[PDB]
Design an enzyme around this catalytic site. Sequence first.
Site, PDB file in Angstrom:
ATOM      1  N   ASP B 123       0.814  -1.175   0.135  1.00  0.00           N
ATOM      2  CA  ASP B 123      -0.160  -0.077   0.012  1.00  0.00           C
ATOM      3  C   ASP B 123       0.779   1.214   0.115  1.00  0.00           C
ATOM      4  OD1 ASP B 123       0.768   0.240   2.748  1.00  0.00           O
ATOM      5  OD2 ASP B 123      -1.114  -0.569   3.587  1.00  0.00           O
ATOM      6  N   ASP B 125       2.917   2.954   2.035  1.00  0.00           N
ATOM      7  CA  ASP B 125       3.242   3.965   3.044  1.00  0.00           C
ATOM      8  C   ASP B 125       4.382   3.840   3.897  1.00  0.00           C
ATOM      9  OD1 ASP B 125       2.730   1.563   4.741  1.00  0.00           O
ATOM     10  OD2 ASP B 125       0.710   2.165   5.254  1.00  0.00           O
ATOM     11  N   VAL B 127       5.270   1.076   5.605  1.00  0.00           N
ATOM     12  CA  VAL B 127       5.400   0.071   6.769  1.00  0.00           C
ATOM     13  C   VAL B 127       4.732  -1.248   6.244  1.00  0.00           C
ATOM     14  CG1 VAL B 127       3.179   1.014   7.652  1.00  0.00           C
ATOM     15  CG2 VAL B 127       4.369  -0.481   9.055  1.00  0.00           C
ATOM     16  N   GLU B 129       2.194  -4.049   6.056  1.00  0.00           N
ATOM     17  CA  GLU B 129       0.953  -4.516   6.549  1.00  0.00           C
ATOM     18  C   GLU B 129       0.928  -5.840   6.582  1.00  0.00           C
ATOM     19  OE1 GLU B 129       1.549  -2.748   3.822  1.00  0.00           O
ATOM     20  OE2 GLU B 129       0.146  -3.276   2.091  1.00  0.00           O
ATOM     21  N   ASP B 164      26.947  -0.948  -4.343  1.00  0.00           N
ATOM     22  CA  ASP B 164      26.539  -2.037  -3.544  1.00  0.00           C
ATOM     23  C   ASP B 164      25.694  -3.100  -4.176  1.00  0.00           C
ATOM     24  OD1 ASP B 164      25.552   0.657  -1.137  1.00  0.00           O
ATOM     25  OD2 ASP B 164      27.670  -0.388  -1.452  1.00  0.00           O
ATOM     26  N   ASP B 175      23.243   0.157   4.527  1.00  0.00           N
ATOM     27  CA  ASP B 175      22.861  -0.349   3.107  1.00  0.00           C
ATOM     28  C   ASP B 175      21.312  -0.795   3.231  1.00  0.00           C
ATOM     29  OD1 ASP B 175      23.455  -0.925   0.351  1.00  0.00           O
ATOM     30  OD2 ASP B 175      24.198  -2.874   1.061  1.00  0.00           O
ATOM     31  N   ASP B 345      28.350  16.712 -20.465  1.00  0.00           N
ATOM     32  CA  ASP B 345      28.158  15.494 -21.485  1.00  0.00           C
ATOM     33  C   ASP B 345      28.264  14.122 -21.041  1.00  0.00           C
ATOM     34  OD1 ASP B 345      27.818  17.387 -23.547  1.00  0.00           O
ATOM     35  OD2 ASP B 345      29.910  17.710 -24.189  1.00  0.00           O
ATOM     36  N   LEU B 399      20.722  14.769 -24.287  1.00  0.00           N
ATOM     37  CA  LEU B 399      19.727  14.418 -23.408  1.00  0.00           C
ATOM     38  C   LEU B 399      19.081  15.369 -22.468  1.00  0.00           C
ATOM     39  CD1 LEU B 399      18.171  11.797 -22.074  1.00  0.00           C
ATOM     40  CD2 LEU B 399      20.112  11.505 -20.742  1.00  0.00           C
ATOM     41  N   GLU B 400      17.805  15.541 -22.656  1.00  0.00           N
ATOM     42  CA  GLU B 400      17.276  16.750 -21.535  1.00  0.00           C
ATOM     43  C   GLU B 400      15.682  16.300 -21.377  1.00  0.00           C
ATOM     44  OE1 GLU B 400      20.655  18.707 -21.604  1.00  0.00           O
ATOM     45  OE2 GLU B 400      18.867  19.554 -20.403  1.00  0.00           O
ATOM     46  N   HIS B 459      23.663  18.099 -30.342  1.00  0.00           N
ATOM     47  CA  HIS B 459      23.165  17.862 -29.012  1.00  0.00           C
ATOM     48  C   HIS B 459      21.899  18.918 -28.924  1.00  0.00           C
ATOM     49  CE1 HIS B 459      27.261  16.890 -27.023  1.00  0.00           C
ATOM     50  NE2 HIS B 459      26.818  15.760 -28.160  1.00  0.00           N
ATOM     51  N   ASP B 461      20.808  20.450 -26.390  1.00  0.00           N
ATOM     52  CA  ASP B 461      21.059  21.547 -25.469  1.00  0.00           C
ATOM     53  C   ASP B 461      21.885  22.796 -26.098  1.00  0.00           C
ATOM     54  OD1 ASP B 461      23.858  20.919 -25.343  1.00  0.00           O
ATOM     55  OD2 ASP B 461      23.948  20.675 -23.276  1.00  0.00           O
ATOM     56  N   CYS B 635      33.908  24.583 -21.060  1.00  0.00           N
ATOM     57  CA  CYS B 635      33.417  24.336 -19.643  1.00  0.00           C
ATOM     58  C   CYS B 635      32.396  23.871 -19.436  1.00  0.00           C
ATOM     59  CB  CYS B 635      33.176  25.933 -18.947  1.00  0.00           C
ATOM     60  SG  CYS B 635      34.492  27.014 -19.048  1.00  0.00           S
TER      61      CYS B 635
END
Lengths: 655, 655
Positions: B123, B125, B127, B129, B164, B175, B345, B399-400, B459, B461, B635
């Site tokens: 559900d 939340d 916790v 259930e 990990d 972890d 990039d 990629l945007e 690109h 961008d 830059c």
Amino acid sequence: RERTVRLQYGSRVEAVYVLGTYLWTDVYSAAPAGAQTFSLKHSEHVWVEVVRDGEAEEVATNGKQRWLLSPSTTLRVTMSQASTEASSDKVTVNYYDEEGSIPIDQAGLFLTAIEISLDVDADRDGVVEKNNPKKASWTWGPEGQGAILLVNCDRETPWLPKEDCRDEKVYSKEDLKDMSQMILRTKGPDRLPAGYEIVLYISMSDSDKVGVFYVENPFFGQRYIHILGRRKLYHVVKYTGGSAELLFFVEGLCFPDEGFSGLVSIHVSLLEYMAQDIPLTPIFTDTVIFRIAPWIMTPNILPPVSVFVCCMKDNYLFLKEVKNLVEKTNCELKVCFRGDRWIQDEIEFGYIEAPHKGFPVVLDSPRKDFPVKELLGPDFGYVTREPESVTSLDSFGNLEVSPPVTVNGKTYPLGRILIGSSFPLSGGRRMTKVVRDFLKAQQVQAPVELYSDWLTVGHVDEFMSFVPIPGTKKFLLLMASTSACYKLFREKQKDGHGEAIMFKGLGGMSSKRITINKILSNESLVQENLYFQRCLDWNRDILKKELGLTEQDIIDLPALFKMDEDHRARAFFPNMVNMIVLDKDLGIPKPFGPQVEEECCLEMHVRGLLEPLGLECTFIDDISAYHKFLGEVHCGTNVRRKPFTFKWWHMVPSR
Amino acid sequence: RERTVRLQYGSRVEAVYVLGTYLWTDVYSAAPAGAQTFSLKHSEHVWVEVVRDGEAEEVATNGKQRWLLSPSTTLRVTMSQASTEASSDKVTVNYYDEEGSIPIDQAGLFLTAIEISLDVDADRDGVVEKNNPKKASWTWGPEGQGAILLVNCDRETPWLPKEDCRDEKVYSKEDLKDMSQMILRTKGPDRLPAGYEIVLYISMSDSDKVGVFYVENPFFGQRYIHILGRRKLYHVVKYTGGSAELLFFVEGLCFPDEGFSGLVSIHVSLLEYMAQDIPLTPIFTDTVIFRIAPWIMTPNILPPVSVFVCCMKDNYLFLKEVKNLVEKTNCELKVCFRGDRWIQDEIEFGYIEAPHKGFPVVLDSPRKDFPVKELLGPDFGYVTREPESVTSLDSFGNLEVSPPVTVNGKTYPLGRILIGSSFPLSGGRRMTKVVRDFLKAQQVQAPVELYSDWLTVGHVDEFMSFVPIPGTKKFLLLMASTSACYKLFREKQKDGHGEAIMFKGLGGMSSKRITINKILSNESLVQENLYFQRCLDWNRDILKKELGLTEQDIIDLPALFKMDEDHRARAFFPNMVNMIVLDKDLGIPKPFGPQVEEECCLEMHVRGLLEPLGLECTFIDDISAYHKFLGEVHCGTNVRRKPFTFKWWHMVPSR
Ligand SMILES: [Ca+2]
Ligand SMILES: [Ca+2]
Ligand SMILES: [Ca+2]
Ligand SMILES: [Ca+2]
Ligand SMILES: [Ca+2]
Ligand SMILES: [Ca+2]
Ligand SMILES: [Ca+2]
Ligand SMILES: [Ca+2]
Ligand SMILES: [Ca+2]
Ligand SMILES: [Ca+2]
């Protein structure tokens, strides 16, 4: 869709306009430096709005109105009808500076409107409607839309071995009847303007999923050009003026599978030539989607059409009794004299359906070092999957399908496919992934795995079957039961029949002298069959859960097994559950059970279960010609049935 | 679920009963031959019904009632509470023959009831259930349910290089906070009856998608046992009596991808030992499903947290001006002194979220012969895809992602990913399939391909960006425009500024003496840029269609390009559209445009567009340290942002 077209400083712009779009036009960039205001004229069939920062105002063909030149003041240009040769469609913008009302410059847009629509039958009635607004999507259900394609897996003419989809060629006109229609409808003047062309195309990925043909009618006869498909990703279309239609025929080359959802798309684009070495600009693109129809199994409740039977030429009783059975019905009998059971084990009769057409399609069991293609013919199709190493669980005796069921309120209008397997942690046998993936990908029969691996051969049809209940819409699950057999034999023994002999008339069994007493005294055999009953009951529970069945829907037929070294079962006497179901009429394997008052007590017991329901039983002897029964049946039958009335595309499968 | 349990002729049956099921019990098969009727007794906590052909009747613990023995007369057996040591739970059936009321035989069923439930937070939340009835399915949307799992792609401790999830080991307790909880809840007596065991398991296929850990607290400290995962498909569970809970931690090992939907399942079964060499029988099975959370991009409208910048140590103006920009905000600046732009990039900052936890996750550009792992750390994760040969279009400058949009009434609450490509028939460059497949498989950002291949670097961008409109919930698309630039330069020329010089202060440009006049006279440059404006406009139209934008949502920023031998564009002066967006504050690349009255006319023009909207412009000089501008920026910047408030699992993606 709105499309961007800029006036050019200070040169005229010529553009194709595609109906169903409109242009937003920048008049500001073309204005000479210093210009203050602009006015405009336009022709009769061009509609022009001045849009000043979001607010749009319609403008007359020749007015004198002027607006302030602004980057945020633009035109919206619309046309409702294609250009003809009588057309001069244009918009002309005049620019003015602060001093004086005479134009200092002008920029113009000359337009040729054309209609371009790639049309399919997306409303699924068999006729190709004009520009269905939903033609680019595919949705399931009664309210769903989008076009359907058949895998063209049959073979129109015998002179070639392979199914029709294996190549890029069309020979017979009849082939086109298997194919879905796609029409490119256009309207325009005699020619496209200089630098344009119309192109149909598909993706590299879809190129092995489809093929598309154009029919030409030149001098010496009709011919079929394959224009998209394997190694053809695009085709330049010849433009004809006026109102024109180009008719295309589309075939599917393969069924949905692991990694292929069944959806394919075809595009048409108007491309503009920019210059040499520069790619052409798609100006306009229209897209249609097809879904390739899934392969669907037929359960035992569907009307029988043809009974296919295989057996050795001299098994006379089998042939006579099967012929007699089928004569009670309206079915045709087809006899063939690959394994002895190959007709049952190596082939499964399914079908495919599209709004325009459908035909039966045979599924062939994985390799048996040779494929069975002999049934491939006109409107009888073929499909197969080639693995993983094959086991007995890959045979189609291990592949069945339920009648339509509802489970937890979820409806399965086509029933559910059932295949035998082993427990997950067992390390036992399982049908090859390639075939399982195939059945799963068809989606509309939502397969369930049962437990068949406790049987030596390992087929669900050894332990279970379905029959319709005559005069109703209902059905029964039939289950083999060892407990039913032991109960019956213990009764007959108590009744004074313990010396009653089985296998009477099978000369190769005689020396064994197997009686009810001999069976009931065999202690290890009792334990083996209690264990087999646990295996049957585990299946019973799965079937009840996954098919939404209660004990009222189940009849238990007496059965008995012997255990092998792998602790797997083989029939002690013929399994009566695997039976020919033709509506109310049932061919039931003759059990050769103990004779009581000169009748087989297994036959009498089975009649007592089934006959009150209006089922008519005919026992069919397939073993007498062999003089004995070792647990193997040497004959096979397969019934080809009418497809479901319910259309698969009306189903709504889970995501 | 109903489960089949037969009484055994004439021996006692002992069975485990799992709460939430019930038994249908055959008493007929166990009856001795000749028996007529039966009666029954049962204990306090066992509920027994006699069901005669569908009709069920409750029976007292000890009555004398008798029923006719029939195959269609059975028992239904139910228990509502687990057995304890004080329990004797049983049902005993007595059989009678025609003569006399004294039992001739009896059969019995001794039962041990246990509760077994594999529980997850379905559900959503945070916790876990007890036994969510929907825990075995996964549904999208506000009303949807089923449990969520994070790919554990971060790294808890620096002493190991890999994320990990790369191994089967857990070292740090921290972890586990990344992991979803799964609890096996049981209730029962001190021990399972002889011949049973409880087993957790996963499929071979899911074994590289998940890992599952159990936490032990032995003497010398806490330890984490990996019990399911790579090369562990099952784990035998140690049963503890009474009410018990076993806590497990689950990690995802990989993101959804081509061929992996993101759904995984974990099972627990009660298995019954049959005999040696026989597989164990699953008596009961409980299943939970997880969906692995997708990787999600952050658009420019989301609050900035950290500004990451890369540049050479001595580019002082860039660093000073960027530091000044960020000081106007609440953001942190991080500076690094791989390509010169690698931060922009080679990496993309996304995130992942589950109800319990979320963290940012870096996507790494395909190989640059070496991976960039240096950002991998605690709650900063890593993921990459390894191809196909890589081109410039594989860089994340290509990629945007858009702000949230609604298109044709379909809502995209997380925005849509945008990637540059070439026309379908062009034979041009395209981002590698492996990365495209990855982005598509995340599903919640529904990617759109734009046309970037007219640019040398290629690109998105370079030509477009998004900015929020301050004091509102709205945003603007910013588009590079050559027409805006030509309009502005022609105005300044008309105004008497034609000799105004660009690149002032860049000593390596000085000998070129580039003025407005020199630019406007260059005829081939004019044609190249008209063509580039067509490429920009083609993108404008796609963006308007796929993002549901109008001209009111778009501002055009002046830009200018030069063409190379491939007919592709590179910036003539720095592209101002690719800018650092921190809410109302914008770092805009300094253009070095023609000076009019000692101000850059490009800077003044951009301020006039943006400032009225409450956007504050800061021009950032990244080129002065190089003395000239050849079309390349040395830059890069990347802004890490807060995740969307909208929870991805509340979205309903198309089928
Ligand atoms: Ca139609
Ligand atoms: Ca063909
Ligand atoms: Ca055909
Ligand atoms: Ca045909
Ligand atoms: Ca079959
Ligand atoms: Ca919860
Ligand atoms: Ca680890
Ligand atoms: Ca971690
Ligand atoms: Ca962590
Ligand atoms: Ca990016």
